[PDB]
């Protein structure tokens, strides 16, 4: 029964001696609220629907349906569309359904009820109910001829059902379609680094918390954390993302002004040795001290905490986002050469860091690191300990990339900005 | 019949000894084909921000035979040979010793073309 | 005219069948402008038409895997087209496709207004590559090729963060594929006949570019759709589907006569003279089309005998009615309603429709035409063989593509759904002739089509 | 604290690898700062550092505890562009190896993005940081000028046999021996300079072997080093055993 | 008698025939495509369920003479010919010559009376213990080998290989057994022929991967080791494993993923020399364990893997350092770890009998190579190799798998080149050392045990070299339907 202490962004204490088990995706009510709001929320851009209806650009990139322009003002009376869509989405009056309009009436934010999530086997019945409700609201407010109903439908639904995705419909959720998963239970780790940095307003360790929250929700969904492995993944959650015992912040404030990766390595190896976690087992003839692990889950928790601390130090010192692909790799490599131990996640974090670098230096770029989610084929490999680092560095960038946080901010960040469990995830963990 | 032999010096041949070694391998009796390949010497930089810069190389103009002239071409090394007689399998190992000034490594058996591939 | 046996028209037995599907499956369209925006913004290098030209000689000769076999791979070139004449003239005349030159003025104006001022490159990878494995590595092949051509032509090192930003901006930011991924059972990848929508096949063939009669353009898409979708994706059983013996042509020209008689010239080109689509108009044209075709069958018994199976009678009546209703109203779903009314009228006139399942797409056909439910409603321009109703059985999709073309050809549109696809195949250097597809299978059944992708040079005689 | 910082090995090569990680090299040669930026080829020598974005002192940073907690480095604060330094290190007893040059850049330099291949080693940072890193690489014994050429593009030559004068094969002549001393006349991307850099004196063949970081059977056998063999065995056993049961 | 290059012309391993690396690519040489075409067009359907539906639900008598009639009907029908009388279009006979169907049974008594022109017999194609293993594995069941045209799979895709099969199976049953040509029996037969009794080597891939089913991502390593029939015709287990290494590095690293370095994993003989050395080393040390036999094998312990893998890598490192003959290519230093890891993996599997022992030997090899030379492959190389050593003996969801069921759709092995062929060789070596008749799928050992294939699955690397010098004739060419 591990008893982790969790501290916040600024390093002050939140709740003393919480159980490791209570931070699980399956037990904590807070992370349940994050994943339910991720499941049900969907944002519809009425300005996009209006341009689709007038111009004829619906259902994909480059597609234009000519001659069927349906000239209509959607942004001008978006409040009326808002209460109509609240009427059609909802199961009963006064349920857990709220659609609210964005500034200027250019968008609205559909949140499907909890019952439309309970009554469906997967997560994205919210998308379909919201898209159909918006479509029927548009039909009811035109007075359109029924031979112009399909145009007003595919302006909202895109090229679905011909395409497996909606593909151009202005109804858009955060998670991808369940057919576009990588494996069994990876649908909840399909939130890229730009979105999850925009959600938390580019705070670093308030971002690495969120991606670790989503990533260990994905790990607990896939059956990859049962029995004693559940302790292993959950201790990695506690130490890397959620700031266990101020470790990942102490390394930063100790190695901020002149620290490097190597000073971080010396810092956490000193901490691991001083904590009784790692012992020396056979001093070699050259004075080398080979090391053994007294408790391997807690040692991998220190290796994860050190990996996030090292990417904090290296990326924030550089004020650049591309340094994860070096930092995770060479940090875990020099850690293994320093101790004679395995790195974080027994080489998997170092491997996926090599994948990060191969991905984001030469071919198939994926932005820089901002288009990194754990659902991708090159990022899925580690069991939850690299995408927190990536999103943490994306929060620390100073504007080196062009696909900035402001590019998808109106898409996702303002959508999830009113939710304090989304905005500041570390303190909104209680149970 | 014609056995495949390759000479592998421990250092890449600078041209100042590549006149003598390759010319020595033309007094070796019974030769079919002489193959040698070293890394590229480019006249122009073909990559990076320095693309389109002209390079004169110190390792160029390697060979002067004398009965003919072999013009300027890239560095030499891994001199693969084709000889009818197996009695000069080891005399090529012998005459490599006198005009290459250092240790050379060695291998044997399958190095050069016999019958044509699909590009031919 | 040059018509031959159905035996040497089956798609494996016919070269041009295979070569137009190879041409469709090997082509991808890649956006080019926001890569230049990356190069301007955070590579410090000012993109010029000279840099564009040098990029084009790098990318066009790099297609055979250069810095594969030079000889085998030859059907490979990358061309450019822009909706912005400010740089369309400084580009070399051997790598450019002028929207002004190949089109009429109003069609080119519609194309430019649709795409704006953007630049797009048209990539055709070798056919041998698309024949060896599936045509789902066209994306990845052209991706590695244009990445190598940025790194070669514009002089950057490999392995930089700005190079990574350019790498994502190059190829997986604005990629236009022919089709997309497929659902559960028939889970093929991109650039397959399942994902190739009816508007895409309407835009791929180029008779709308080179002809002003919307009947010929519609029936041309009908022939191309019948062969591609039915024989490739679903095959067969009387494979020569509605592009021989011209009963469908006769019914279509009669329908155009009927429409320009009853309605005030509603079947000629121009969007001003289009009657709005009501049920009465659809009922009138569809019933008159079907009753005319049925009277032709019952009046000429040799044509009732030549089309021996009920599937092709139902398909040629429904396709003629559908293209008729689409020309008259300018609406593609009006054409779909005419198709299904023709199916029902044929069934009640003769008490027999098709072969067990030739009516699956038809009984849930008329009801799904004007729906706006989720998986039920879609304009016919965006539909394809991935649509839930149309997925699995033969004999239908060609008329479904021809209906969408008839909608956007009766009003004289420049394109059905994509101007990128329309301009991309508007280059005459393809081995296939997309301007006249149904003549090319006459050439492909007479052993006069010479496709590429063959391996004769690299194998013994 | 944990002041120790090391690597397995009782041989010469383990000592040199501990030196290369620790950066406890002894400096062998002189290149002036303007000559260093001259041979880096990114800008005009003896100029000011360009800026791809304005300084972070005056756009204002986001309110982040990490951003306030870690120093920006001189280069980022000024807002300089990111530039790089390249090195192809030879197999044949060159004093540095790509992974160990990468760990040199990792322990001893901030804001750094090292990268490893077989044949080269990216070090990417801001210009005022990459400048100091390439200074410390070029002056010390880590960069033997004959066994390590600074080659921004076409880095091929690391696995190639050395030239007969003990110099690693230079594809674009970004350094060469003239007059018995090693001579640098091009930039790392191989565009030349009006000035010519006295890059110093190359080591003899028997001297580089005394201070190299590669293991070679004809110099220092990997088989005879039971310490590093046992290290690889320890980490492999731990990886596989804790992949079965992480207990 | 003079010349220079900058590239070493590769002699194919074990053969005297030599090809430069830019015509050993899957565009120029034809057998590279032909072997994959033979993987594509082949499927196997099982006859017993169809026969018993004909038996009980029609009252029809199943007997060897009706079965001979049904296979002659099918073997006529398969090359795209009409067997049921609807006026369908027939594929032209000259384009379709590579189509046949052949049965193999677990009952020899049934196997006698079926016409031997349509029977692949287990006894004539295997030795005694091989045949006993396969007859005990498949039961007393009747299966049949379907090979659709190469032109059909070449034209559309490899997902039509099961569908053209089930479409031409049902017409054959109808024509030879006199059903209605459309009734409720034909659905049972053709659903047996498509999803009930169908077994196919290529499985479906997730849509995030942008490829479809029956594409070499789905073709598992044990499936490919069962496809190649070197274990049927030869006895030296190292030769078997390295033939599978060559075939896997060709079909996995060159076709399923497109600097084309990985040809050298089966060229120039380094891989062999190392494997023959360490099989001699195991025979000397562990009391002749790596020879053929079942009980002579050592149990797969961690220290056995450590000793064998470390010794094999230090031999490879000493060979390279002593003669760097295969080095000095422009993008050198990669395909330098692949051959060492393949040698160590085959060495670990040939001694233990466990395939994951071979994988652990592979990853120990990469660690030893990296920290001997301070460099490990090219940029993208050790994603999986740095992951893999902890992923081999695990039993998690997306991690636990024997090599035998692994394939290129495995999460670590999805996107990197130069790795999957060694895995196929390891999975073969785990069983060729004990002389197993099959590794995973016994159906594909029998199915590809046939000499009418234009490819020769007895020696794949010999066929790659044979096609590299233009005396290989493929099948799917449009020879007649094009002009001259």
Swiss-Prot record, chain C:
Details of cofactor binding: Binds 2 coenzyme F430 non-covalently per MCR complex. Coenzyme F430 is a yellow nickel porphinoid. Methyl-coenzyme-M reductase is activated when the enzyme-bound coenzyme F430 is reduced to the Ni(I) oxidation state.
5-methylarginine: residues bearing it: 186
Subcellular location: Cytoplasm
Keywords of this entry: Cytoplasm, Metal-binding, Methanogenesis, Methylation, Nickel, Transferase
Record bears the keyword Cytoplasm: yes
Residues that, per the record, bind coenzyme B: 140, 171-172, 185
EC number in record: 2.8.4.1
Pathway as given in its UniProt record: One-carbon metabolism; methyl-coenzyme M reduction; methane from methyl-coenzyme M: step 1/1
Annotated GO MF terms: coenzyme-B sulfoethylthiotransferase activity; metal ion binding
GO CC field: cytoplasm
Binding residues annotated for coenzyme M, in chain numbering: 238, 356
Catalytic activity entry: coenzyme B + methyl-coenzyme M = methane + coenzyme M-coenzyme B heterodisulfide
GO biological process, alphabetically ordered: methanogenesis
Positions in coiled-coil regions: none
Family affiliation: Belongs to the methyl-coenzyme M reductase alpha subunit family.
Purpose: Component of the methyl-coenzyme M reductase (MCR) I that catalyzes the reductive cleavage of methyl-coenzyme M (CoM-S-CH3 or 2-(methylthio)ethanesulfonate) using coenzyme B (CoB or 7-mercaptoheptanoylthreonine phosphate) as reductant which results in the production of methane and the mixed heterodisulfide of CoB and CoM (CoM-S-S-CoB). This is the final step in methanogenesis.
Protein name (database record): Methyl-coenzyme M reductase subunit alpha
The organism of origin for this protein: Methanosarcina acetivorans (strain ATCC 35395 / DSM 2834 / JCM 12185 / C2A)
Parent-record interval covered: 92 to 569 of 570
């Amino acid at each position: 029964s591990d008893t982790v202490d969790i501290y916040d962004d600024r390093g002050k204490l939140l709740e003393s001696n919480v159980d490791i088990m209570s931070l699980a995706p399956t037990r904590n009510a807070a992370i349940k609220k994050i994943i339910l709001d991720t499941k049900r929320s969907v944002a519809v851009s009425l300005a996009g629907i209006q341009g689709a209806l007038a111009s004829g650009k619906m259902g994909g990139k480059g597609r234009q349906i000519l001659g069927r322009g349906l000239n209509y003002d959607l942004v001008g009376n978006a409040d009326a569309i808002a209460e109509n869509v609240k009427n059609l989405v909802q199961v009963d009056e006064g349920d857990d359904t709220s659609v609210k309009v964005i500034k200027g009436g250019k968008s609205l934010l559909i949140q499907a009820p909890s019952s439309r999530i309970a009554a469906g086997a997967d997560y994205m019945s919210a998308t379909t109910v919201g898209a159909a409700a918006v479509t029927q609201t548009i039909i009811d407010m035109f007075g359109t001829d029924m031979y112009d109903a399909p145009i007003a439908k595919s302006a909202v639904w895109g090229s679905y059902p011909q395409t497996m995705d909606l593909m151009g419909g202005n109804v858009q959720g955060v998670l991808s379609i369940p057919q576009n998963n990588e494996g069994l239970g990876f649908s909840l780790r399909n939130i890229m680094a730009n979105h999850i940095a925009a959600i938390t307003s580019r705070g670093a360790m308030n971002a690495a918390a969120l991606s670790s929250i989503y990533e260990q929700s994905g790990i607990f969904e896939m059956g990859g954390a049962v029995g004693m492995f559940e302790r292993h993944q959950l201790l990695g959650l506690a130490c890397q993302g959620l700031n266990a015992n101020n470790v990942v912040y102490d390394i930063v404030k100790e190695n901020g002004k002149d620290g490097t990766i190597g000073t971080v390595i010396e810092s956490i190896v000193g901490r691991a040795v001083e904590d009784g976690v790692i012992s020396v087992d056979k001093t070699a003839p050259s004075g080398y001290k080979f090391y053994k692990a007294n408790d391997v889950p807690m040692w991998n928790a220190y290796a994860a905490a050190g990996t996030l601390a090292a990417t904090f130090v290296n990326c924030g010192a550089g004020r650049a986002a591309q340094n994860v692909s070096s930092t995770l790799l060479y940090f875990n490599d020099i850690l293994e050469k320093e101790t004679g131990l395995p790195g974080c996640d027994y080489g998997k974090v170092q491997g996926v860091a090599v994948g990060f670098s191969f991905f984001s230096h030469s071919i198939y770029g994926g932005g820089g690191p901002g288009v990194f989610n754990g659902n991708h084929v090159v990022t899925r490999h580690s069991r939850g300990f690299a995408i927190p680092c990536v999103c943490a560095a994306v929060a620390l960038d100073a504007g080196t990339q062009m696909f900035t946080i402001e590019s998808t901010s109106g898409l996702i960040g303002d959508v999830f900005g009113s939710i304090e469990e989304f905005r500041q995830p570390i303190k909104a963990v209680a149970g | 019949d014609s056995i495949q032999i390759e000479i592998f010096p421990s250092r890449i041949l600078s041209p100042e000894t590549a006149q003598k070694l390759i010319s020595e391998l033309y007094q070796v009796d019974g030769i079919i084909r002489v193959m040698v390949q070293g890394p590229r010497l480019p006249e122009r930089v073909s990559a990076g921000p320095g693309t389109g810069e002209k390079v004169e190389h110190p390792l160029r103009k390697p060979i002067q035979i004398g009965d003919q002239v072999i013009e300027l071409k890239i560095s030499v090394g891994r001199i693969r040979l084709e000889i009818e007689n197996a009695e000069t399998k080891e005399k090529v190992r012998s005459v490599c010793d006198k005009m290459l000034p250092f240790s050379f490594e060695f291998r044997e058996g399958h190095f050069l073309r016999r019958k044509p591939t699909v590009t031919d | 005219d040059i018509v031959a046996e159905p035996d040497d028209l089956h798609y494996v037995n016919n070269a041009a069948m295979q070569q137009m599907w190879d041409d469709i499956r090997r082509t991808c369209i890649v956006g080019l402008d926001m890569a230049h925006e990356t190069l301007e913004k955070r590579l410090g290098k000012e993109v010029t038409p000279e840099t564009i030209n040098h990029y084009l000689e790098t990318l066009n000769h790099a297609m055979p895997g250069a810095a594969t076999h030079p000889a085998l791979v030859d059907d490979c070139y990358v061309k450019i087209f822009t909706g912005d004449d400010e740089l369309a003239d400084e580009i070399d005349k051997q790598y450019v496709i002028n929207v002004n030159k190949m089109f009429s003025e109003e069609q080119a104006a519609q194309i430019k207004a649709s795409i704006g001022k953007t630049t797009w490159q048209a990539i055709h990878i070798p056919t041998i590559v698309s024949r060896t494995t599936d045509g789902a590595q066209t994306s990845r092949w052209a991706a590695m090729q244009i990445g190598m051509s940025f790194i070669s032509a514009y002089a950057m090192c490999a392995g930089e963060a700005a190079v990574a930003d350019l790498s994502f901006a190059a190829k997986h930011a604005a990629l236009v594929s022919m089709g997309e991924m497929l659902p559960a059972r028939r889970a093929r990848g991109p650039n397959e006949p399942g994902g190739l929508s009816f508007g895409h096949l309407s835009d791929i063939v180029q008779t709308s570019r080179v002809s002003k009669d919307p009947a010929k353009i519609a029936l041309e898409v009908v022939g191309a759709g019948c062969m591609l979708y039915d024989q490739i994706w679903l095959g067969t059983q009387y494979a020569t589907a509605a592009y021989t013996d011209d009963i469908l042509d006769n019914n279509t020209y009669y329908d155009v006569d009927y429409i320009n008689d009853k309605y005030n010239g509603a079947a000629n080109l121009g969007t001003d003279n289009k009657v709005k689509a009501t049920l009465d108009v659809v009922k009138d044209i569809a019933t008159e089309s079907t009753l005319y075709g049925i009277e032709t069958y019952e009046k000429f018994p040799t044509a009732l005998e030549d089309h021996f199976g009920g599937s092709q009678r139902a398909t040629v009546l429904a396709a003629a009615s559908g293209v008729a209703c689409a020309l008259a109203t300018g609406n593609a779903n009006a054409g779909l309603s005419g198709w299904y009314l023709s199916m029902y009228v044929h069934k009640e006139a003769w008490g027999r429709l098709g072969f067990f399942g030739f009516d699956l797409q038809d009984q849930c056909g008329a009801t799904n035409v004007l729906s706006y439910q989720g998986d039920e409603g879609l304009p016919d321009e965006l539909r394809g063989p991935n649509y839930p109703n149309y997925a699995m059985n033969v004999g239908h999709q060609g008329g479904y593509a021809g209906i969408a073309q008839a909608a956007h050809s009766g009003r004289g549109d420049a394109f059905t759904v994509n101007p990128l696809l329309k301009v991309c195949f508007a280059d005459e250097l393809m081995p296939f002739n997309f301007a006249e597809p149904r003549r090319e299978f006459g050439r492909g059944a007479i052993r006069e089509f010479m496709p590429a992708g063959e391996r004769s040079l690299v194998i013994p005689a | 604290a944990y002041e120790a910082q090391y690597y397995p090995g009782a041989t010469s090569v383990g000592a040199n690898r501990r030196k290369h990680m620790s950066g406890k090299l002894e400096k062998l040669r002189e290149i002036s700062d303007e000559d260093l930026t001259a041979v880096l080829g990114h800008r005009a020598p003896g100029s000011d550092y360009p800026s791809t974005h304005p300084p972070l002192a005056e756009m204002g940073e986001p309110a982040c505890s990490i951003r306030e907690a870690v120093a920006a480095t001189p280069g980022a604060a000024a807002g300089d562009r990111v530039r790089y330094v390249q090195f192809a290190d030879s197999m044949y007893n060159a004093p540095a190896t790509p992974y160990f040059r990468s760990y040199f850049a990792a322990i001893n330099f901030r804001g750094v993005d090292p990268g490893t291949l077989s044949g080269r080693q990216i070090v990417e940072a801001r210009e005022r940081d990459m400048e100091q890193c390439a200074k410390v690489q070029m002056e010390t014994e880590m960069t033997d000028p004959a066994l390590a050429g600074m080659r921004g593009a076409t880095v091929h030559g690391h696995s190639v046999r050395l030239q007969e004068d003990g110099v690693m094969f230079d594809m674009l002549d970004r350094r060469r021996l003239e007059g018995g001393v090693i001579i640098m006349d091009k930039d790392q991307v191989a565009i030349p300079l009006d000035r010519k850099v006295n890059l110093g004196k190359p080591m003899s063949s028997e001297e580089a072997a005394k201070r190299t970081t590669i293991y070679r059977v004809d110099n220092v056998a990997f088989r005879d080093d039971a310490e590093v063999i046992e290290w690889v065995h320890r980490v492999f056993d731990q990886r596989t055993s804790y992949g079965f049961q992480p207990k």
